Design a protein around this ligand. Structure first.
Ligand SMILES: [Mn+2]
Length: 745
DNA sequence: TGAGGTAGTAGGTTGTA
DNA sequence: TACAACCTACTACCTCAT
């Protein structure tokens, strides 16, 4: 079979315990403690003397070689204390920082094509290689004709163990930069407005974006208080203001919004964050070229890391520190335990389905009792194309026929819909202001003959006249009428095309079409392990000071959605209170008693982004009600990636394979073939439980495979994934009361 | 938004070592 | 205390075959 590994290179040799220098910082300046400026004074001292290292442990600063004791620094003066050999087995993070520093210092001295150093390094974990590595193993600069440049931000993070071995964890991440500035684009007259720009001089954190431009030169005193070049002289930045010439004295001021105030900077400073928005809108053939190189299978970034640690080579400063260029054989050598989870059995109306497409051909497992009466919004210029699209979706859902022709791959009466084209409601709406969208949605929903909305919206692209998607979704979720929507690209795909590449669109339309009205398309025949329900939670933190409240959901040992419940009382901060948990678990016991007449004997509580506190509430609250319970936290977005070795030639891993260490389980849930990227796996953590992670991850993978609004599987499990969707869609959900119909799908 | 995945890029907290 | 993981938002392609 195909085993799995992880982006790790074992350092050949051993890190020996070396002679360091204990430094202490004296509280000279206005700062009371030396803790909050130990990073600041750290990189100041590092900037002092030929870029020599300095490391941070809570009170003792370590340097490897004897720096001369300087006290000329204005806020802080430091003091040498003693010099001794520090033990590696007590100092893990310190010698890890030593190894990352020395591989930085060895990669600085490497040049490619003679003049050009390969890696621009600021002595951190981010090693930006100026020179790419391509598909055909050519380490070549790839620049655009328009000034764009791809680079690949290596992320080292080596850790050392108690014996002395250092393991270099890596992460390829192709980043985006340009040699141009916004002044150079002003020289060819490119429009600077609408540009997410990044100050490489001021390292403030904020979405800096261009405000405007008037005609004042930079050699004139402005609203900052003076001529800004004098403040560049004032900010200990003479080496960057000494350079620019008399034509650059004719630079025109371009101001920038750093999300709290205006900033008046020179345009020779500011460089645009050239996102894929920018690469597409300004040179799209460059984007079509580079998606072979930023969407990247395991073979390609393994080739890159092979080149990377081939370029590191060996370091004699750490006693023959060399790195292997091959991955591991298995993660058992690293500490985890691999394995593959078998696929879940899925059933529909007449029992088992072979694959996730057969449910249209045989029938759905859980239909809601009643009839689903459609109603369609569409653009007024796009009448007949929408007519053919709605005729296609209704013929598919009711009559089992596709563009009139009946076909054996689709069962009849798949959803009990009631849609008569001579009798039902069509409302053409013109693409205009958003209040026209509001009056169109209420002019549909005033008539109580509709149970489901199919709006035809414009595409997610197409900046001119914009989406009617989000105000429609807000109104149809607030009016308690679920809606599945169509971008008009898909409408002419239904009308004009004559092949199955509108039928696949139609498959995901029908799965969403039954998910929105509370039906469940398929379930498991059995969820592994003794279990009666699932509980998924999440909290959201989009910006600073914003804590989205909790959202709960319940499933069963079939995994059908019984209920998703929003708690009523608002929380306090990131970590939630106890009354929210009280009402959530009282209501989840009420809902499971409502749907099965008994209490749960097992409960697997899935969880997104909580800490291990509040667990005593779970302990006493389920000791009073004496159900054995399980709490498993699902970690959504990890920088950790996953590989798969086929006889030394390594590629993407198949879906359903996990790697596990105790309570730490990484698992890839999705299948991605090559030239499309590499699958970004999950991370699974158990805070309290009596179950092994085998049946836990089997539940995890089965609830990846029961996404109820698409033919292909979701990456997240649908407990924490659907709770995460509701925590995204916090204003779509009705507040405080129970519901079955999935709005977000 | 068909629909999910990848990827980027910006931006914040705070948990476990 | 730090700080590496964790979150979050938005686009761009790309393929879906029973
Ligand atoms: Mn949808």
């Amino acid at each position: 079979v195909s085993n799995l590994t992880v982006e790790a290179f074992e350092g050949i040799g051993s890190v020996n315990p070396m002679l360091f220098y204990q430094y202490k910082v004296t509280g000279k300046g206005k700062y009371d403690n030396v803790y909050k400026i130990i990073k600041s004074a750290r990189y100041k001292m590092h900037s002092k003397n030929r870029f020599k290292p300095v490391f941070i442990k809570d009170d003792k600063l370590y340097t490897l070689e004897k720096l001369p004791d300087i006290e000329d620094l204005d806020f802080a003066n430091i003091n040498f204390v003693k010099s001794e050999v520090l033990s590696i087995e007590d100092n893990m993070s310190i010698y890890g920082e030593v190894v990352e520093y020395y591989i930085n210092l060895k990669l600085k001295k490497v040049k490619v094509l003679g003049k050009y150093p390969k890696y621009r390094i600021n002595y951190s974990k981010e090693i930006l290689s100026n020179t790419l590595l391509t598909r055909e193993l050519k380490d070549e600069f790839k620049k655009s004709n328009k000034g764009f440049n791809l680079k690949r931000k290596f992320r080292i993070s080596p850790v050392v163990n108690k014996m002395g071995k250092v393991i270099l964890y890596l992460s390829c991440s192709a980043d985006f930069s340009t040699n141009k500035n916004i002044y150079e684009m002003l020289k060819e007259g490119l429009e600077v407005e609408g540009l997410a720009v990044k100050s490489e001089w001021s390292n403030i954190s904020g979405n800096l974006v261009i405000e405007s431009v008037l005609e004042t030169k930079i050699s004139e005193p402005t609203s900052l208080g003076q001529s800004l070049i004098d403040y560049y002289k004032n900010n200990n930045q003479g080496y960057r203001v000494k350079d620019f010439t008399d034509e650059d004295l004719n630079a025109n001021i371009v101001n920038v919004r750093g999300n709290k105030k205006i900033y008046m900077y020179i345009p020779h400073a500011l460089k645009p964050i050239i996102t894929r928005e920018y690469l597409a809108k300004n040179d799209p053939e460059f984007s079509k070229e580079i998606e072979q190189l930023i969407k990247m299978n395991m073979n390609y970034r393994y080739e890159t890391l092979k080149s990377f640690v081939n370029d590191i080579g060996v370091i004699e400063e750490l006693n023959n520190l060399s790195f292997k260029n091959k991955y591991y054989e298995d993660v058992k050598l690293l500490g985890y335990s691999s394995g593959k989870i078998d696929e879940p059995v899925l059933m529909g109306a007449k029992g088992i389905i072979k694959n996730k497409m057969q449910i249209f051909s045989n029938g759905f497992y859980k239909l809601p009792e009643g009839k689903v009466r459609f109603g369609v919004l569409y653009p007024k210029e796009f009448d007949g194309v929408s007519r053919k699209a709605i005729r296609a979706i209704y013929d598919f859902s009711k009559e089992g026929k596709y563009h009139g022709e009946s076909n054996k791959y689709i069962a009849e009466h798949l959803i009990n819909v009631e849609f008569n084209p001579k009798e039902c409601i069509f409302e053409g709406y013109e693409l205009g202001d958003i209040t026209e969208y509001k009056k169109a949605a209420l002019k549909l929903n005033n008539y109580n003959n509709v149970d489901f909305v199919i709006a035809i919206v414009p595409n997610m692209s197409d900046e001119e006249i914009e989406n009617s998607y989000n105000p429609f979704k807000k109104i149809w979720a607030e009016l308690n009428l679920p809606s599945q929507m169509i971008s008009v690209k898909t409408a002419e795909i239904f009308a004009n095309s004559r092949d199955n590449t509108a039928l696949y669109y139609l498959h995901n339309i029908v799965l969403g079409i039954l998910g929105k009205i509370g039906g469940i398309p398929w379930v498991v025949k059995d969820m592994k392990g003794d279990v009666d329900c699932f509980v998924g939670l999440d909290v959201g933190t989009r910006e600073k000071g914003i804590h989205y409240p909790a959202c709960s959901v319940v499933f069963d040992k079939y995994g059908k959605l019984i209920n998703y419940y929003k708690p009523n009382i608002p929380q306090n901060g990131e970590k939630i209170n106890t009354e929210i948990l009280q009402e959530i678990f009282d209501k989840v016991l009420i809902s499971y008693e409502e749907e099965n007449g008994a209490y749960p004997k097992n409960i697997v509580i899935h969880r997104a982004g909580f800490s291990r506190e509040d667990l005593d509430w779970y302990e006493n609250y389920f000791g009073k009600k004496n159900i054995k319970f399980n709490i498993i936290e699902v970690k959504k977005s990890t920088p950790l990636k996953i590989a798969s070795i086929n006889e030394g030639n390594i590629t993407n891993p198949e879906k359903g394979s996990y790697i596990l260490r105790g309570n730490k389980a990484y698992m890839v849930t999705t299948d991605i073939k090559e030239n499309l990227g590499s699958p970004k796996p999950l991370k699974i953590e158990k805070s309290y439980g009596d179950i092994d992670m085998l049946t836990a991850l089997s539940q995890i993978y089965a609830l990846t495979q029961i996404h109820v609004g698409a033919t292909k599987s979701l990456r997240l499990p649908i407990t924490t994934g659907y709770a995460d969707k509701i925590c995204k869609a916090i204003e779509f959900i009705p507040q405080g009361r129970v519901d079955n119909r999935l709005f977000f799908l």
